[model samples]
Target: PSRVVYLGSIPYDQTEEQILDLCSNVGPVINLKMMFDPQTGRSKGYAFIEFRDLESSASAVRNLNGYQLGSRFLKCGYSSNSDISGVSLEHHHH
Candidate 1:
């Protein structure tokens, strides 16, 4: 859905609660899909967040895209798909 936002450059140490806390400022978060390393059980530095509406999603991208967490700048953008499995196409180099 267009209401899904791709979040990147997340701090490894940050918890889901922390990220949701930040996102809640814009609107209610419907869901959060954070990527993790299978073997190490560590954050992959990215996640996908679903907001309650398009306006909220857009607001997040505009306000949080360059937001700094720890030493990394968060990258926020509208995701093309709501399903994480479909996001593989996004990794293709332009």
Candidate 2:
């Protein structure tokens, strides 16, 4: 059990609010953030969800893990990882 749940393998269609709304079913959601690609500025098929405590996080993982939202399956797990910060798109010249 952890205070945060790493939501991996999420579909691109889902948004941050959608993730928070879904996780709220388990308990109070501290916050939810969807990671976006620096290059595309779009969802990177993953998110981070935070609960007030470990209980809520564990519950969320149990309910959301293996849940399919589209053609892909959702993955939820307890992790200490935090959101990506200060990232920007890059340009490469060959």
Candidate 3:
């Protein structure tokens, strides 16, 4: 599997730096992409994260899933190649 993980149910108020810090607990974060609404300019409460290694990605899914951040519980999962509910797959780009 790839080193990409999908995060859902994230707090809308959380920032990229906060996420990077949180995910860094498991492993090094290579990249992060937080979704936002174009009209309202607010967070979509979801994001895609790329870890330095596959093991880290797996660790994130296993350990970070259902982790409570703020008032919301995080939903962690592996990102697949196929599109998921109109969310485009964000695999390795480099």
Candidate 4:
């Protein structure tokens, strides 16, 4: 489902609020997370956005993928690790 979206190449300067604002245009976001370097606290240039529906998820991917943010491309897609094992947001890569 589109709700389990994958993202990459996010800008370190982009705030969590900005990420939700951009993606929320497509649909309601159930949960959102942006991975950062544990030591430096800088973004790793990626994020995971859980949308309200498949269409919303797809819309987010179409609208945000390859979209420019400062000088980085906002790559978005479905998460590869999502499965029947049911990994929660806390279990996602950090």
Give me the candidate number with maximum TM-score: 1
Task: Judge candidate 2 against the unseen true structure and give its global Cα lDDT, from 0 to 1.
Answer: 0.71
**Ranking of predictions according to lDDT:** 1, 3, 4, 2
* Residue 49 C-alpha lDDT in model 3: 83
lDDT of 3 by residue, 1-94 (tens): 5687889888887878888999999999877888667776578788788888888999999989999998888999888732334235353331
Deviation of model 4 at 82, angstroms: 4.8
Summed backbone clashes in each candidate are: 0, 0, 0, 2
Task: Give Cα distance to truth, residue 4, candidate 3, Å.
Answer: 0.2
lDDT of each: 0.82, 0.71, 0.80, 0.73
Candidate 1 lDDT tens digits, 7-81 = 888898687788899999989998887766777767878777888888899899999999989899999998888
Model 3 CA lDDT for position 26 = 93
Give the number of the best model, judged by lDDT: 1
Ten residues in sequence with the least summed lDDT for candidate 2: 85-94
* Candidates ranked, most accurate by TM-score first: 1, 3, 4, 2
- Candidate achieving higher TM-score, 2 or 4: 4
TM-score of 1: 0.81
Off by over 4 Å in 2: 37-41, 81-94
Candidate 3: pairs in clash:
none
